[PDB]
Amino acid sequence: SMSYTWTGALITPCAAEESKLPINPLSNSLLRHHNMVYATTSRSASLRQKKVTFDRLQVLDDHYRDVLKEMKAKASTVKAKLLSIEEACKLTPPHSAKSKFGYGAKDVRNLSSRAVNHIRSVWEDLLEDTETPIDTTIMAKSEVFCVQPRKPARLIVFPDLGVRVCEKMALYDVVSTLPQAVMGSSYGFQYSPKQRVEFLVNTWKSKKCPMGFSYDTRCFDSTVTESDIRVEESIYQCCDLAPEARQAIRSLTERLYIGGPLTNSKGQNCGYRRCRASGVLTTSCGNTLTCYLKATAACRAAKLQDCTMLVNGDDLVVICESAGTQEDAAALRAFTEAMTRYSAPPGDPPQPEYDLELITSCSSNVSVAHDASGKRVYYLTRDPTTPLARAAWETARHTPINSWLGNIIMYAPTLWARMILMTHFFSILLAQEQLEKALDCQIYGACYSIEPLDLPQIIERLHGLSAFTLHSYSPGEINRVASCLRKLGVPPLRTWRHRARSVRAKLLSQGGRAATCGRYLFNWAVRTKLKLTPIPAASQLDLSGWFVAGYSGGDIYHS
Numbered sequence: 110s111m112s113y114t115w116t117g118a119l120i121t122p123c124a125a126e127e128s129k130l131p132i133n134p135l136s137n138s139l140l141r142h143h144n145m146v147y148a149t150t151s152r153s154a155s156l157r158q159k160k161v162t163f164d165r166l167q168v169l170d171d172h173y174r175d176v177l178k179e180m181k182a183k184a185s186t187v188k189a190k191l192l193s194i195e196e197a198c199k200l201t202p203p204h205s206a207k208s209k210f211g212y213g214a215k216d217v218r219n220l221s222s223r224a225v226n227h228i229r230s231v232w233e234d235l236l237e238d239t240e241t242p243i244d245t246t247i248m249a250k251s252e253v254f255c256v257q258p259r260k261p262a263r264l265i266v267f268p269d270l271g272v273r274v275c276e277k278m279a280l281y282d283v284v285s286t287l288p289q290a291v292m293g294s295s296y297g298f299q300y301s302p303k304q305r306v307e308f309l310v311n312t313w314k315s316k317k318c319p320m321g322f323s324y325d326t327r328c329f330d331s332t333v334t335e336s337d338i339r340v341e342e343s344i345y346q347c348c349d350l351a352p353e354a355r356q357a358i359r360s361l362t363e364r365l366y367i368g369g370p371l372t373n374s375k376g377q378n379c380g381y382r383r384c385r386a387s388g389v390l391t392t393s394c395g396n397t398l399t400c401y402l403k404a405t406a407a408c409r410a411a412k413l414q415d416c417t418m419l420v421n422g423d424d425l426v427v428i429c430e431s432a433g434t435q436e437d438a439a440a441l442r443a444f445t446e447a448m449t450r451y452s453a454p455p456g457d458p459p460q461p462e463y464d465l466e467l468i469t470s471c472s473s474n475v476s477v478a479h480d481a482s483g484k485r486v487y488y489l490t491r492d493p494t495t496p497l498a499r500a501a502w503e504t505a506r507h508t509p510i511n512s513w514l515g516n517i518i519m520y521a522p523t524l525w526a527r528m529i530l531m532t533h534f535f536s537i538l539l540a541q542e543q544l545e546k547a548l549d550c551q552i553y554g555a556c557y558s559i560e561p562l563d564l565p566q567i568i569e570r571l572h573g574l575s576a577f578t579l580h581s582y583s584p585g586e587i588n589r590v591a592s593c594l595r596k597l598g599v600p601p602l603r604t605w606r607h608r609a610r611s612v613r614a615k616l617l618s619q620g621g622r623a624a625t626c627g628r629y630l631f632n633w634a635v636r637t638k639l640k641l642t643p644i645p646a647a648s649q650l651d652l653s654g655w656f657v658a659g660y661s662g663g664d665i666y667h668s
């Protein structure tokens with residue numbers, strides 16, 4: 110079927126949209142080529158629509174069916190619990206889109222009579238009505254990027270707040286536990302960045318002669334078929350479920366997940382969707398399971414040897430045993446043809462890689478540096494262009510989610526996060542006297558409230574003390590960072606070092622947690638190094654819940 114059908118009505122904005130970076134007096138300090146930074150708007154919606162609208166092709170075979178049964182067998186061991194309305198409401202982000210039925214996120218979190226009553230009625234409706242397609246809103250996503258030698262806006266589709274809370278009640282436990290049960294070590298969201306690196310390095314070293322490749326599916330969401338979504342449900346149905354949860358999943362599958370009507374911000378009928386909606390609770394879990402199923406089966410059809418998958422939603426990386434240069438190239442092409450028959454055609458053509466550092470997955474790659482002792486330390490990094498472009502935007506405008514904070518946390522050991530992000534933002538927080546103000550950021554799609562002053566402990570717990578002492582980064586990494594700085598007009602190393610020394614001195618003079626930040630985060634800026642010992646508060650931190658499952662588009666808030 111067609112991934113989408115359009116009536117002609119436009120994808121409209123719900124308010125004024127900004128596309129250019131403001132001439133802010135603080136962003137210029139970070140990067141001077143502000144005209145290279147832009148934010149996607151609804152003005153590019155039609156370009157996106159054209160790209161994601163097509164008739165899907167899907168041919169399933171014995172390998173696909175064999176893998177599916179293997180997956181259902183593992184899912185059969187799971188017992189999922191139904192969440193109470195109270196628990197589901199608590200998972201709702203403070204600024205989640207308000208309901209059109211007279212209440213908003215704040216009311217939901219406070220369990221106001223009107224919110225709870227409506228949510229109960231929506232739930233009862235899911236139990237009684239197994240067919241009525243649920244209405245959804247389609248909007249052009251606003252994301253920041255750097256121009257390339259421009260990307261049209263992504264299309265986000267989501268149902269009303271009332272329905273979102275019901276999804277949580279019926280499926281939050283399922284999407285948080287089932288992927289792990291079914292895919293085991295191949296489920297990427299169970300790993301912190303350091304653990305992902307560990308799994309990738311260990312997997313790579315377990316092969317006699319490793320070969321790996323990332324596989325980019327062309328607009329994954331639009332390639333997901335009605336069949337794929339019902340297969341996904343068949344996996345969920347293998348769980349032991351409360352009667353009402355079983356019905357809710359059945360109803361949500363047919364009324365929401367497989368497709369439904371699209372309405373714009375103005376309330377006009379925009380069209381119909383017959384593929385994956387980006388804004389529902391099962392999107393991350395569903396995409397992960399679907400990608401894993403197709404890829405695992407494709408590997409068998411392609412005769413790839415000893416394939417180890419690492420899947421994060423629609424993001425896939427495969428590491429296997431090489432059968433020789435020519436053989437690998439042929440097997441990869443066969444893999445691609447199999448994925449294409451499964452309705453997972455390639456975007457960027459895949460290529461075999463024989464160097465782990467050259468494989469980019471989840472927009473990142475493994476690289477190596479050295480700790481104070483001179484020992485090699487593996488860590489996760491990525492091209493800093495997008496992170497810096499977004500950091501500039503967030504410096505110029507107030508944004509609900511602070512990607513710069515998430516990036517400092519996830520990429521703390523990198524040369525760029527330490528030299529630029531830490532220096533830039535701690536300088537600003539100092540100047541505005543906002544060091545202790547908690548900020549929201551996202552980790553694997555879930556929203557978290559984090560105190561900047563707690564970064565030292567967080568970083569030590571997630572990355573280890575070496576994160577504060579890494580040096581001698583790889584030639585490849587240095588070149589990439591350097592090129593990015595030239596491209597964006599970011600000040601050179603010397604400028605950041607001078608700014609860091611100044612920021613460090615100020616933080617130290619404040620004592621308390623601020624001084625700890627100065628000591629650990631900026632030890633790289635001084636010659637007279639400080640002996641960095643284990644931070645007491647680090648051993649008392651439980652960040653376990655931070656890396657359990659993916660929730661992008663799931664409207665999830667973890668307090």
Ligand SMILES: O=c1ncn(Cc2ccc(F)cc2F)c2ccc(Oc3ncccc3C(F)(F)F)cc12
Pocket residue numbers: 523524525526527528529578579580581582583586587588590591592594602633
């Ligand atoms: O390997 C390193 N080993 C140590 N330092 C010191 C250092 C500075 C900031 C930081 F947070 C961590 C550090 F350990 C470096 C500082 C800069 C650098 O990279 C460059 N070197 C020369 C020119 C340009 C660059 C780059 F644009 F920054 F990549 C590489 C290294």
Ligand SMILES: [Mg+2]
Pocket residue numbers: 298299300301653656657
């Ligand atoms: Mg974990």
Ligand SMILES: [Mg+2]
Pocket residue numbers: 325326327328329423456
């Ligand atoms: Mg893709």
